[PDB]
Design a protein around this motif. Structure first.
Motif, PDB file in Angstrom:
ATOM      1  N   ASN B 180       0.824  -1.202   0.000  1.00  0.00           N
ATOM      2  CA  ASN B 180       0.000   0.000   0.000  1.00  0.00           C
ATOM      3  C   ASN B 180       0.862   1.256   0.000  1.00  0.00           C
ATOM      4  OD1 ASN B 180      -2.974  -0.661   0.130  1.00  0.00           O
ATOM      5  ND2 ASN B 180      -2.248  -1.932   1.835  1.00  0.00           N
ATOM      6  N   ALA B 181       1.726   1.374   1.005  1.00  0.00           N
ATOM      7  CA  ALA B 181       2.621   2.521   1.104  1.00  0.00           C
ATOM      8  C   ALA B 181       3.307   2.789  -0.232  1.00  0.00           C
ATOM      9  CB  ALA B 181       3.651   2.299   2.201  1.00  0.00           C
ATOM     10  N   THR B 182       3.561   1.722  -0.985  1.00  0.00           N
ATOM     11  CA  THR B 182       4.224   1.839  -2.278  1.00  0.00           C
ATOM     12  C   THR B 182       3.242   2.252  -3.368  1.00  0.00           C
ATOM     13  OG1 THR B 182       5.862   0.145  -1.685  1.00  0.00           O
ATOM     14  CG2 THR B 182       5.614   0.677  -4.024  1.00  0.00           C
ATOM     15  N   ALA B 183       1.954   2.204  -3.050  1.00  0.00           N
ATOM     16  CA  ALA B 183       0.921   2.604  -3.996  1.00  0.00           C
ATOM     17  C   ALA B 183       0.569   4.078  -3.817  1.00  0.00           C
ATOM     18  CB  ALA B 183      -0.317   1.736  -3.832  1.00  0.00           C
ATOM     19  N   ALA B 184       1.230   4.724  -2.861  1.00  0.00           N
ATOM     20  CA  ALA B 184       0.984   6.132  -2.573  1.00  0.00           C
ATOM     21  C   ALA B 184       1.475   7.038  -3.701  1.00  0.00           C
ATOM     22  CB  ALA B 184       1.636   6.524  -1.254  1.00  0.00           C
ATOM     23  N   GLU B 185       0.895   8.232  -3.783  1.00  0.00           N
ATOM     24  CA  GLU B 185       1.272   9.208  -4.799  1.00  0.00           C
ATOM     25  C   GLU B 185       1.046   8.666  -6.208  1.00  0.00           C
ATOM     26  OE1 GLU B 185       5.268  10.601  -4.451  1.00  0.00           O
ATOM     27  OE2 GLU B 185       5.016  12.220  -5.911  1.00  0.00           O
ATOM     28  N   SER B 186      -0.197   8.258  -6.477  1.00  0.00           N
ATOM     29  CA  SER B 186      -0.552   7.717  -7.785  1.00  0.00           C
ATOM     30  C   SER B 186      -1.930   8.205  -8.220  1.00  0.00           C
ATOM     31  CB  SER B 186      -0.527   6.187  -7.747  1.00  0.00           C
ATOM     32  OG  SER B 186      -1.073   5.640  -8.937  1.00  0.00           O
TER      33      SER B 186
ATOM     34  N   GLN F  50     -17.415   8.616  -5.679  1.00  0.00           N
ATOM     35  CA  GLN F  50     -16.049   8.763  -6.192  1.00  0.00           C
ATOM     36  C   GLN F  50     -15.088   7.875  -5.402  1.00  0.00           C
ATOM     37  OE1 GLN F  50     -14.963  12.955  -6.140  1.00  0.00           O
ATOM     38  NE2 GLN F  50     -16.631  13.507  -7.538  1.00  0.00           N
ATOM     39  N   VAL F  51     -15.265   7.859  -4.078  1.00  0.00           N
ATOM     40  CA  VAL F  51     -14.495   7.009  -3.159  1.00  0.00           C
ATOM     41  C   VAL F  51     -14.733   5.526  -3.475  1.00  0.00           C
ATOM     42  CG1 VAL F  51     -14.013   6.440  -0.725  1.00  0.00           C
ATOM     43  CG2 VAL F  51     -14.463   8.794  -1.355  1.00  0.00           C
ATOM     44  N   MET F  52     -15.981   5.178  -3.796  1.00  0.00           N
ATOM     45  CA  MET F  52     -16.354   3.842  -4.282  1.00  0.00           C
ATOM     46  C   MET F  52     -15.484   3.417  -5.479  1.00  0.00           C
ATOM     47  SD  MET F  52     -19.111   1.317  -4.839  1.00  0.00           S
ATOM     48  CE  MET F  52     -20.674   2.003  -4.286  1.00  0.00           C
ATOM     49  N   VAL F  53     -15.440   4.271  -6.506  1.00  0.00           N
ATOM     50  CA  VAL F  53     -14.731   3.997  -7.767  1.00  0.00           C
ATOM     51  C   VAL F  53     -13.205   3.980  -7.587  1.00  0.00           C
ATOM     52  CG1 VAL F  53     -14.352   4.757 -10.166  1.00  0.00           C
ATOM     53  CG2 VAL F  53     -16.646   4.851  -9.192  1.00  0.00           C
ATOM     54  N   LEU F  54     -12.671   4.990  -6.897  1.00  0.00           N
ATOM     55  CA  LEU F  54     -11.229   5.104  -6.639  1.00  0.00           C
ATOM     56  C   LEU F  54     -10.657   3.942  -5.823  1.00  0.00           C
ATOM     57  CD1 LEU F  54     -10.772   8.945  -5.917  1.00  0.00           C
ATOM     58  CD2 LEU F  54     -10.010   7.765  -7.988  1.00  0.00           C
ATOM     59  N   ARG F  55     -11.401   3.495  -4.804  1.00  0.00           N
ATOM     60  CA  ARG F  55     -11.032   2.298  -4.029  1.00  0.00           C
ATOM     61  C   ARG F  55     -11.053   1.002  -4.840  1.00  0.00           C
ATOM     62  NH1 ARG F  55     -13.050   0.133  -0.404  1.00  0.00           N
ATOM     63  NH2 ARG F  55     -11.674  -0.086   1.408  1.00  0.00           N
ATOM     64  N   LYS F  56     -11.866   0.962  -5.899  1.00  0.00           N
ATOM     65  CA  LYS F  56     -11.911  -0.184  -6.810  1.00  0.00           C
ATOM     66  C   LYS F  56     -10.614  -0.238  -7.632  1.00  0.00           C
ATOM     67  CE  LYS F  56     -15.336  -2.748  -7.925  1.00  0.00           C
ATOM     68  NZ  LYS F  56     -15.576  -4.168  -7.546  1.00  0.00           N
ATOM     69  N   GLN F  57     -10.199   0.929  -8.136  1.00  0.00           N
ATOM     70  CA  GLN F  57      -8.971   1.095  -8.926  1.00  0.00           C
ATOM     71  C   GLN F  57      -7.707   0.842  -8.105  1.00  0.00           C
ATOM     72  OE1 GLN F  57      -9.050   4.979 -10.858  1.00  0.00           O
ATOM     73  NE2 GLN F  57     -11.010   4.548 -11.867  1.00  0.00           N
ATOM     74  N   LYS F  58      -7.672   1.401  -6.892  1.00  0.00           N
ATOM     75  CA  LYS F  58      -6.563   1.214  -5.953  1.00  0.00           C
ATOM     76  C   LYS F  58      -6.432  -0.249  -5.524  1.00  0.00           C
ATOM     77  CE  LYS F  58      -4.504   3.191  -1.765  1.00  0.00           C
ATOM     78  NZ  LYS F  58      -4.803   3.790  -0.436  1.00  0.00           N
TER      79      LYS F  58
END
Lengths: 170, 197, 36, 190, 232, 69
Positions: B180-186, F50-58
């Motif tokens: 996760n920490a490595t997924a920061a700033e993206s 938006q949080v729904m969609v962004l958390r899916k991508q992340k």
RNA sequence: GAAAUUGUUGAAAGGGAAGGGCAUUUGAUCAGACAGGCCAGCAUCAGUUUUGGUGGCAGGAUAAAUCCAUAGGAAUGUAGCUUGCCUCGGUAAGUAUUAUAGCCUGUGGGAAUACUGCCAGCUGGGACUGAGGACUGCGACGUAAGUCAAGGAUGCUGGCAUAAUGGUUAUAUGCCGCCCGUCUUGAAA
RNA sequence: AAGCUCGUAUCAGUUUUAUGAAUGUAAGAAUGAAGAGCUUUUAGUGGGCCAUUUUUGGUAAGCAGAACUGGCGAUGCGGGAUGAACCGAACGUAGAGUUAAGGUGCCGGAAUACACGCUCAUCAGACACCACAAAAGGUGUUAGUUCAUCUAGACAGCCGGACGGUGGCCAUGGAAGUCGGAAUCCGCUAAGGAGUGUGUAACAACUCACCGGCCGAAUGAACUA
RNA sequence: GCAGUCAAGCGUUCAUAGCGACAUUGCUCGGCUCUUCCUAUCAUACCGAAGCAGAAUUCGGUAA
RNA sequence: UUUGCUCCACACAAUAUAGAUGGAUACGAAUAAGGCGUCCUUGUGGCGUCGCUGAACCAUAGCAGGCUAGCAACGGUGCACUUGGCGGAAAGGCCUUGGGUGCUUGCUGGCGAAUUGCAAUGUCAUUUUGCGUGGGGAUAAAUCAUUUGUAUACGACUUAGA
């Protein structure tokens, strides 16, 4: 919660005696009506007068002079008991006179079982210079750079069930 | 919130514990106290023991097979503390109690399952430091209960297996926390921050 | 040990009301004794 | 009057070191190591300069402060227990029947057999605590020496050794017979 | 509550307070102008009839003892607080024990006296005793290893618990007499003493340590100076 | 911070600004956690979507980041 | 061809009582209207009420405070200065009226706000209620005609039209509930 | 109930003022009310128990007699867990709101509220004109009050001195301060009693009360709650 | 128990309006049989004090 | 018993539910203390960091979730086959080895929804069954009656007998 009142009385002006001596005192009460009643109660004890013989001339709320400076108060108290009445001197560290007499009334009820009708507040005075503060539990807080912790703190729950096993750190 | 609610009756306070379980039920919530033995009361041992003992002295004079059934097991010892706390002679009572379950120790499928606590009945919080409390495991034993040891034994072993599970857990967690920490700033990330998450 | 009998804290209604009569009796004595 | 801060000073000499987490105390030094649980007591330890230790009770009544001084005493007793050690000398006296005190080791228990006390066929077995060593005084008649590290081990064993030899259903004034702690002291005298 | 009860007593003598200290204050100050010279004595310890021997040695010159802090504030502590001119030079020099001697005599007569005066006393703690003593290994005697036993009485059996418990020496009584088995040393020559060692030498009545009373400083009224003399 | 005892409001404000305890507060995790709850409270439904969609991508990229080591 | 009392058949209930009252679920069973009825939703209204948001004022020491300007003080003494003995500079024991922290008290200034009280101030949410039946009255707005929240509810809209209302009934459930009559007495018994 | 008047100024378990030796009068005082008077006759009714306040007698202690007053009785309902006299309460049938007394851990409707305190009880306490065992005991704990000491050094603590007349007189086998009988005095000091206990047959020795030496801030006693 | 001797305090100030505890001094309807319970225990169990040499005992504590 | 009885699949009726409607999301211990991360003299060790509420975290967008065109990456997930290891406290479940198999909202397209008329839980859960199906599987005892007597008021008990 209390309020300080200057209450005056001068036994009603009749024939041959105009303008009597206007007896002034400071009364701690919750409102104006109780202050007035307490004043008459005190007058009947200080000398031989009655409620009908006099008049309240001026009732005035005495606000505290500097409610931001922490003071070292010394309160002369006397009160009726299981036995005869007796004097007492308790020293209170507080911000205002109203708040200091407040802490006294709750402490008098807590340690001596005296209600509001028993307690005669004689004199509330500021102790100006430290090392003249007599009581040791007040002199306890007058030391240089006092740094004391509050160990073992309770965390107030908003729900019935917690998911942590609480940590009473501070 | 859940279908069931597993309480870890450790270092708790029978009373405040029961009373928070009692009503909980009557309101239709299913509950399952565990680790009952480790439960707590309030007051120098002897104190309680002397207490219970006088309770253990009340029996139907003429036929003691009929009078107050004195239970040892820390569970029952704490089911009577919650019982007499619920109109248990009516129907709405029986129906309540019926969705309650006390367990001395932690058996399955409760083991492998989250277990809560009740702050308002937590001895650490409630009690004032330096004031004798009386565990429940002791009282019980010194009055009839005879499975203190076993459980103990079976409890230590139940932890181990637990520990290991964890270990494995802390690890897999770290791994995810590092990725996760490595997924920061993206872009995506960046953004979420602005929307707290 | 053989735990001995415990005193009750249930005050029966005869006791409680009899307490009130005994109290008011102590008043009537104290008012008379105040005069002498 | 509920004190805001009360503290004592545990003085640590050169040879010993004190390691404390929560309320479990090491005293590691010349003679050996001593450990003591104190989680019943509710205090706070503070190492000021690696040679002085500060116990602390904040917001304590007279009962809690009464506990505060006893921590200082017990931890110091462990320190002098390691530096100097403890040596209790017990002298046993008899009128007629010779008391026969020996050390036996059945099942690795290291018992003390007290035989022939006041002409008695019973053989008194006293358990020896883990950390107390028993030797007899050379060139002095009728003397048993108890020595170790802990004060509790040495002194409780000395108490056990003289409470097994109770003069039962007889005089105190007439029957002198018994074992007695003649001297409480230290191993290394300075 | 839960406090130490002070041991209640019914004895004739009572405390003194500040009344007696003021009497000694006034007595020192009124003795300063009268007597010529002031000697400050460092007499570490004195048997009372030895002081009464000093009083009977001369009745003319006055000897006033008592608390140091009474004598300090009677003579003068500093430059500002002083009775007479440069009197505080000797009060800075007196450190330990009480003694102070007003005199109307010759200087060399006094220093001759205290150098010629030495008396046999009990050996003390923290001071070395010039004897190496062992108690005999039979019956212990009242004089104890100093005189022939045929001229001596055996010790009183009643004080044997004092010997065993308080004096540490290993004693047991046989046929009314205190008995030890092996010879026991208590003190050796040129060696520093403990408290109990001086108490064993006291109980056996051994007075084998000399006592010479000493002085440290000296005053003059007319010359306004303080002289310092180190005699023992 | 360094405050002399019994300080009136102006003295408190003087040492308050000079020590810069406000920025030291905002730097801490605790203020960030308080601001985190306040940010989630005043969220619109569309912003919550938006949080729904962004958390899916992340989630996608993070799950690809795992199953590698 | 009644009831008591009994048999069979069908339903239901039943862990040391039963029958009774309030309310509802459940099961059983039943009445109309359909030769405009049953139940509802919203809006604008009126009466009673509950619960918020926000504005204007007025009172007191024309709040007291804070803040600012000025004049004195001591401190749990501030920078500095002097001094003791050491881990290099820390501490300690004096000075030093704040200097490179501050505090207290006194005098003056200009404000804010709390608390208390008023508004025939405004603006929301929620509940229960709709009695009466052409018109009269008292009013408000309007240049007038006319309109209106002014002498008690109308407007719009939807589902059903029968077991869906509701009732009767057997039971379940929460809570309540001594066995009547007589005769005594001050009462209960 | 019926008839005849006035529906009124016919009055009132009330206050005021005045007249008087908690009761007596008057009022062109107050406040309240439209149910007033006079004949004629017609049912029922003719016990008391409880409590509060005055007051006279009483006694181990209860109490006993009057007056006036409530309550129950002919009265349901809320509460006091329970109930003859305890707290609340102007009963048609319903709806809504607000409350009384009592309450708000769960049983149980309503705050495991907030704030200052006090208490640990070997069967705490929740109880009540704070009445009975109740005056006390306690090295439980918290507040006080009044006298005391204290940097001329408080309390505690060890270290030392703790003296000679003098083994004071009688006592008696032996009693030197300490088995006992009477004064109980002098001197010397910093202070030491014809002696505070242990002790010996008698002494001795130790002890403390009294000082003095290091030790350096508070402490001591008697009462009250 | 009566009377006196002390006597913490309180008496409306307060010891001379009076009450006053523990001591102290004055002379002087009964009985047969069973069940259960209580301890205020006679014995049995363990202790403490006692001129308790031993034995025997006396008082006291826990104890049903 | 005219295949009576049990077990898998889908199928229709019934019968109920002290009461699903995203997820019961697993260290232990201490509280005058802890958790985690890192480092080393591997310890009751140094350094950093965290709490002060689950207000979390994981899951969560599609006719109550349809049909299709792709783009990116070797991920996530469902279903059923499958290699073991583990779990006895009520274990009745937990991880794991792989092949197939749909789906994926990671990103971008194109269709379809309406008329349930302005709301009416708008039924999607899980038990206990019965009648039907189309496949597996399995081939009893108990009571009475007689006897026995270690039992016995009667019951009951202990026995004995194709």
């Amino acid at each position: 919660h209390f309020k300080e009142y200057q209450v005056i009385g001068r036994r009603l002006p009749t024939e041959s005696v105009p303008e009597p001596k206007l007896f002034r005192m400071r009364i701690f009460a919750s409102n104006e009506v109780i202050a007035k009643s307490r004043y008459w109660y005190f007058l009947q004890k200080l000398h031989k007068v009655k409620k009908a013989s006099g008049e309240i001339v001026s009732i005035n709320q005495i606000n505290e002079a500097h409610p931001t400076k922490v003071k070292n108060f010394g309160v002369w108290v006397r009160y009726d008991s299981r036995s005869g009445t007796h004097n007492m001197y308790k020293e209170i560290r507080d911000v205002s006179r109203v708040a200091a007499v407040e802490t006294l009334y709750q402490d008098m009820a807590a340690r001596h079982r005296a209600r509001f009708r028993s307690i005669h507040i004689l004199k509330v005075a500021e102790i100006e210079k430290t090392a003249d503060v007599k009581r040791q539990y007040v002199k306890q807080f007058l030391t240089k750079d006092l740094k004391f912790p509050l160990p073992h703190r309770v965390q107030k729950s908003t729900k019935t069930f917690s998911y942590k096993r609480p940590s009473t750190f501070y | 919130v859940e279908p069931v609610v597993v309480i870890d009756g450790k270092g708790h306070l029978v009373g405040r514990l029961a009373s928070v379980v009692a009503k909980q039920l009557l309101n239709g919530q299913k509950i399952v106290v565990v680790r009952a033995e480790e439960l707590n009361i309030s007051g120098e041992f002897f104190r309680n023991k002397l207490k219970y003992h006088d309770f253990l002295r009340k029996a139907t004079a003429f036929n003691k097979t009929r009078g107050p059934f004195h239970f040892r097991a820390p569970s029952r010892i704490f089911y009577k503390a919650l019982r007499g706390m619920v109109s248990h002679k009516t129907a709405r009572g029986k129906a309540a109690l019926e969705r309650l379950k006390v367990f001395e120790g932690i058996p399955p499928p409760y083991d492998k399952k989250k277990r809560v606590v009740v702050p308002q009945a937590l001895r650490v919080l409630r009690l004032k430091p330096g004031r004798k409390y009386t565990t429940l495991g002791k009282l019980s034993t010194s009055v009839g209960w005879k499975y203190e040891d076993v459980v103990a034994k079976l409890e230590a072993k139940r932890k181990v297996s637990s520990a290991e599970y964890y270990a494995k857990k802390r690890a897999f967690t770290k791994k995810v926390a590092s990725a996760n920490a490595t997924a920061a700033e993206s872009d995506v990330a960046k953004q979420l921050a602005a929307l707290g998450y | 040990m053989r735990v001995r009998k415990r005193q009750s804290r249930r005050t029966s209604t005869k006791l409680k009301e009899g307490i009130k009569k005994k109290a008011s009796a102590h008043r009537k004595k104290e008012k008379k004794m105040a005069k002498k | 009057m509920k004190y805001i801060q009360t503290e004592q000073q545990i003085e640590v000499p050169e040879g010993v070191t004190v390691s404390i987490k929560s309320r479990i105390v090491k005293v590691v030094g010349p003679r050996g190591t001593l450990t003591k649980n104190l989680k019943h007591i509710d205090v706070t330890f503070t190492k000021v300069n690696n040679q002085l230790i500060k116990v602390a009770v904040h917001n304590g009544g007279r009962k809690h402060v009464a506990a505060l001084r006893t921590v200082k005493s017990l931890v110091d007793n462990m320190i002098t227990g390691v530096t100097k050690g403890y040596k209790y000398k017990m002298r046993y006296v008899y009128a007629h029947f010779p008391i026969n005190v020996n050390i036996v080791e059945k099942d690795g228990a290291k018992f003390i057999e007290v035989r022939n006390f006041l002409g008695d066929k019973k053989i008194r077995n006293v358990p020896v605590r883990d950390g107390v060593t028993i030797e007899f005084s050379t060139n002095v008649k009728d003397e048993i020496v108890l020595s170790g590290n802990s004060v509790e081990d040495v002194s409780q064993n000395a108490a056990d050794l003289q409470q097994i030899c109770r003069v039962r259903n007889k005089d105190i004034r007439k029957f002198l017979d018994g074992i007695y702690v003649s001297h409480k002291g230290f191993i290394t005298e300075d | 509550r839960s406090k130490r009860s002070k041991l209640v007593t019914l004895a004739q003598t009572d405390k003194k307070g500040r009344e007696n200290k003021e009497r000694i204050f006034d007595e020192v100050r009124e003795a300063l102008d009268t007597y010529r010279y002031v000697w400050v004595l460092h007499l570490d310890d004195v048997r009372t009839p030895v002081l009464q021997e000093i009083r009977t040695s001369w009745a003319g010159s006055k000897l006033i003892m008592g608390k140091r802090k009474v004598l300090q504030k009677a003579l003068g502590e500093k430059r500002e607080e002083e009775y007479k001119e440069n009197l505080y030079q000797l009060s800075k020099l007196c450190s330990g024990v009480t003694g102070l001697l007003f005199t109307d005599e010759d200087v060399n007569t006094v220093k001759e006296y205290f150098k010629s005066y030495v008396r046999s006393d009990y050996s003390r703690p923290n001071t070395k005793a010039p004897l190496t003593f062992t108690i005999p290994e039979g019956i212990v005697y009242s004089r104890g290893g100093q005189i022939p036993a045929e001229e001596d009485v055996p010790m009183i059996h009643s004080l044997e618990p004092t010997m065993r418990n308080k004096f540490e020496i290993p004693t047991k009584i046989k046929a009314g007499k205190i008995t030890i088995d092996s010879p026991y040393l208590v003190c050796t020559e040129g060696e520093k003493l403990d408290v109990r060692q001086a108490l064993i030498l006291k109980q056996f009545g051994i007075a084998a340590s000399e006592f010479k009373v000493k002085v440290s400083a000296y005053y003059d009224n007319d010359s306004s100076t303080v002289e310092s003399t180190n005699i023992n | 911070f360094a405050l002399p005892r019994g300080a009136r409001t102006a003295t408190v404000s003087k040492k308050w600004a000079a020590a810069a305890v406000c920025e030291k507060w905002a730097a801490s995790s605790w203020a960030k956690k308080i601001a985190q709850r306040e940010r989630r409270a005043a969220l619109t439904d569309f912003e919550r979507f938006q949080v729904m969609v962004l958390r899916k991508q992340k989630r996608y990229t993070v799950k690809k980041a795992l199953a590698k080591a």
